[PDB]
Amino acid sequence: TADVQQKLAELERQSGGRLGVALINTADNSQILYRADERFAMCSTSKVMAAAAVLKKSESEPNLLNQRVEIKKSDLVNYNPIAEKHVNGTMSLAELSAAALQYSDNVAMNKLIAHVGGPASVTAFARQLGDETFRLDRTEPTLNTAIPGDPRDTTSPRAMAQTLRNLTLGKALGDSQRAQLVTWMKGNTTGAASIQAGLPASWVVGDKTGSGGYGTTNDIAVIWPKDRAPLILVTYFTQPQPKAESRRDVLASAAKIVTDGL
Ligand SMILES: *[B@@-]1(O)O[C@H](CNS(=O)(=O)c2ccc([N+](=O)[O-])cc2)c2ccccc21
Ligand SMILES: [Cl-]
Ligand SMILES: [Cl-]
Ligand code: NA
Ligand code: NA
Ligand code: NA
Numbered sequence: 308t309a310d311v312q313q314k315l316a317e318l319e320r321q322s323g324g325r326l327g328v329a330l331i332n333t334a335d336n337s338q339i340l341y342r343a344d345e346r347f348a349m350c351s352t353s354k355v356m357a358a359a360a361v362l363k364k365s366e367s368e369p370n371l372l373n374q375r376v377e378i379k380k381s382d383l384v385n386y387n388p389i390a391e392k393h394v395n396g397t398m399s400l401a402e403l404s405a406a407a408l409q410y411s412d413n414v415a416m417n418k419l420i421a422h423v424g425g426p427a428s429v430t431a432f433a434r435q436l437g438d439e440t441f442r443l444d445r446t447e448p449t450l451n452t453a454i455p456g457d458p459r460d461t462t463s464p465r466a467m468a469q470t471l472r473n474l475t476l477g478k479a480l481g482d483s484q485r486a487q488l489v490t491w492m493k494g495n496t497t498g499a500a501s502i503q504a505g506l507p508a509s510w511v512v513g514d515k516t517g518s519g520g521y522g523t524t525n526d527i528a529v530i531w532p533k534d535r536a537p538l539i540l541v542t543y544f545t546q547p548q549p550k551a552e553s554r555r556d557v558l559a560s561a562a563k564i565v566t567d568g569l
Contacts, residue, residue, distance in 0.1 A: 318561060325345075327542070328540075333536045346458055349517055354415075354517075360428065373399050376398055378394050389415060436470060440463050454521070475488060475489050476537060476539070492514060500555040501559060504562075506566060507532075511530070512528050513528065513529045522552055525544065526541075526555075526558050
């Protein structure tokens with residue numbers, strides 16, 4: 308609709324920032340796109356690709372997910388809600404994946420990154436899936452600086468929506484691994500104020516949020532609307548001021564705009 312485009316442009320104008328949206332509606336294989344080829348700092352939405360890389364690795368390495376990883380004081384970073392409870396013990400790669408995806412734990416993300424060989428390995432995994440846009444450059448916490456004009460640790464809404472479709476609804480991962488990713492995302496604890504806040508209460512969502520510098524506020528989701536084919540929605544938002552506050556309401560508003568009528 309021209310109307311949906313006008314509404315997204317009006318939302319962006321009023322928000323004061325830069326908004327990126329990609330909706331894929333699998334009912335009819337249609338898309339709604341807004342700045343969908345521009346780059347945005349992913350922040351913690353990048354944790355989906357890191358967990359998926361570990362899941363892919365596990366397809367050839369049974370018991371990979373049970374492998375123990377030491378958590379040390381030296382591993383702590385700036386947001387460690389789960390890992391701080393396990394200092395001086397180990398967590399399994401499954402537990403680290405769940406902590407990264409469901410609590411957005413940054414130690415957990417760093418362990419996923421390290422396990423697969425670092426940010427360039429996460430990026431190479433994206434390339435193997437056919438995503439030639441995603442780039443993970445840094446580890447936690449520096450990957451969240453979100454400086455305007457900086458391509459590090461960015462992707463586009465179109466690419467992330469297409470890749471998330473592949474990961475959650477398509478065949479990027481084996482059936483067990485795909486189901487595990489979906490189960491983890493459906494159990495996310497951090498997304499109630501973002502895409503979920505713009506959808507009817509009855510709809511089921513698996514999502515991963517991200518927040519960072521420049522008031523960057525993001526969410527990527529697979530959505531099961533009541534009695535409808537699933538949707539994929541990416542909403543990325545960033546602001547001009549280094550210390551801008553988060554704007555999860557902008558993501559909720561974008562979600563409402565693009566799903567009105569469904
Ligand atoms: B990354 O973007 O995710 C974590 C946590 N982000 S957060 O903004 O601190 C947050 C948002 C929402 C919730 N919630 O439960 O609703 C909890 C935390 C992170 C931290 C630091 C840097 C990057 C990321
Ligand atoms: Cl409702
Ligand atoms: Cl977040
Ligand atoms: Na980023
Ligand atoms: Na991407
Ligand atoms: Na959400």
